[PDB]
Amino acid sequence: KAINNIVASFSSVNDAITQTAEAIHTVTIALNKIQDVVNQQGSALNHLTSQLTYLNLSSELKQLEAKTASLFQTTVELQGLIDQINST
């Protein structure tokens, strides 16, 4: 039946948007880990060079965090619309 397939299709898409939000969240965790280690090593290299840049991803991290949230928000919005389609 056409409309049940339509509802199921939107639901599969919402699942994909949810997995995308989760993937961006994981990417943020990985970037923040890289920043920490890279700056630990730059510090050490400096200290060692003197005995003888730095990486700032803060803007990109905040934008990705904002995208995680906004994607998760769209999944709630899309679910409500899917609910309305089921209502009709």
What is the contact surface with Na ion in residues (CB under 5 A)? 56, 58-59
| Position 12 contacts a copy of itself (CB under 8 A) | yes
Among a copy of itself, Na ion, none, the one that 55 touches (CB under a kind-dependent 5 to 8 A) is: a copy of itself
Among a copy of itself, Na ion, none, the one that 58 touches (CB under a kind-dependent 5 to 8 A) is: Na ion
CA 82, CA 32: separation in Å to the nearest integer? Answer: 36
Interface map 23-62 toward a copy of itself (x if CB under 8 A): xx-xx-xxx-xxxxxx-xxx-xx--xx--xxxxxx--xx-
**Residue 88 DSSP label:** -
Secondary structure of residue 53 in the 3-state scheme: coil
Neighbours of 53 (CB within 10 A): 6
